[PDB]
Structure 1
Amino acid sequence: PVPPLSVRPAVVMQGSARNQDDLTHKLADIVKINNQLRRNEQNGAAAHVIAEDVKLLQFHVATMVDNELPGLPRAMQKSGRPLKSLKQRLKGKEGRVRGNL
C-alpha cells in the first residue's frame, strides 16, 4: 500500500523546487526496483540477478516500514542522512501517538 499525498506532503521551498518526503523517495526506490525486477523476470536475466533484485526489493520495503534493522545498512538519502521510515514516524516521543495525539 502506497499512502496518499497527505501522509507524504511535497513541501514547496522558497522558490519552485518541490521537495518530496522521505516516504516518497523510498517509494521511488521501491517502484524502481519493482519495475526492474518485473522486466528482469519478463526478459533475459540470470537467476542470481533476479535473486539480487529480490533482495534489494526486500531491503527497500523493510527500510520503508522500519529503517533501524540491526546489521543491515540504513536507507540513505542526499546529504548522508538516513530516511525516516513509517516506524520512526510514530516510534516514541515526538512520534504520532506521543507527539501529536
Structure 2
Amino acid sequence: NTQPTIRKDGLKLVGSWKLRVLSTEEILNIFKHISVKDFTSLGFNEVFSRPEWMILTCLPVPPPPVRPSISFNESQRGEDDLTFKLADILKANISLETLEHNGAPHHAIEEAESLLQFHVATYMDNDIAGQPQALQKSGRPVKSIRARLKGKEGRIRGNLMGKRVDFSARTVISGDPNLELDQVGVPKSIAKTLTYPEVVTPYNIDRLTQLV
C-alpha cells in the first residue's frame, strides 16, 4: 500500500496517493520502530539522537536565569517573553487535559492541537510563513530563543565572540610630536581610573605602599 506525495502546510504533513493529514501522533509510532541499521544509514545515533525524538513528547522548561524580571516598579511585577510564551503553552496545554478527561467532543478537538503545537513552534521561532504574533502583554511581535540566538547582537555573534569588556576606555585623540612612536598619551583622569592588580613583593612594596 503506499507513500503519499507529501506536503507542508503550516505545521502539518499532507498527502496525495492514488485528504488524510498526518496527525502529530502518527509519526511518533513509525520511528518508535524503524531499524537501528535504518536510522544510522540516514543520520542518527542510537543513543544521542532518534527520529522519534525529532518530535515532541515533553518539552523542557528553562529556569529563570534564562528568562527573568522586574521594572520601573516594586510591588508592580516584570517579565521577559519566554515566561509569557512559556504560558500560552502551559495554557492551551491544560485546555486539552480539559476535554479528553472532561467534556469530550470529536471534531473540535483539533481546533486545539494546533494551538498547543503552534505556540510550541512559536516559543522557538516566528519569522516564517503566515502569522507572527504579539501582545497578551506588550504589543508586538516577539522573542523566540532563536533570534536571541541569531546573527549579530544575538548571543554567539554578539555575546560570545564579541563581548563588551572591563578595564577599557575611550576618548578622542590628537597628535603630539614630542612623544615617542610607541607611546600613547593617556589622559590622567583615565589613568586615575583603569587599574592593574599588582602583587605585593619585597621587590615593589616601598613604591607600592606609597601608592595605597
TM-score by length of 1: 0.89
Which structure features the higher share of strand residues? 2
Where structure 2 has 5 or more consecutive residues not aligned to the other structure, the ranges are 1-59, 161-212
Equivalent residue number for residue 104 of structure 2: 45
Report the Cα offset of residue 48 of structure 1. Answer: 2.3
Return the offset for 1:15. Answer: 1.6
2:125 maps to 1:75: no
* Count of aligned residue pairs for this structure pair: 99
Helix, strand or coil at the partner of 2:114? helix
Partner Cα distance (1:9, 1:79) in 2: 16
Residue 50 of structure 1: how far off its partner (Å)? 1.4
So what's the TM-score if we normalise by structure 2? 0.45
Structure 1 segments of 4 or more deviating over 2 A?
none
Q: Which residue of 2 aligns with 1:58?
A: 117
CA RMSD of aligned residues (A): 1.2
Question: Could you give the per-residue CA deviations for residues 32-55 of structure 1, whole angstroms, max 9, x where no partner exists?
Answer: 100111111111232222111101
Q: Which has the higher helix share?
A: 1
State the percentage of identical aligned residues: 58
- Structure number with greater CO (CA < 8 Å, separation at least 6) is 1
1:1-101 matches, cutoff 5 A? 1-10=60-69, 12-16=70-74, 17-71=76-130, 73-77=131-135, 78-101=137-160
- Taking the aligned partners of 1:7 and 1:79, their CA distance within structure 2 comes to 19
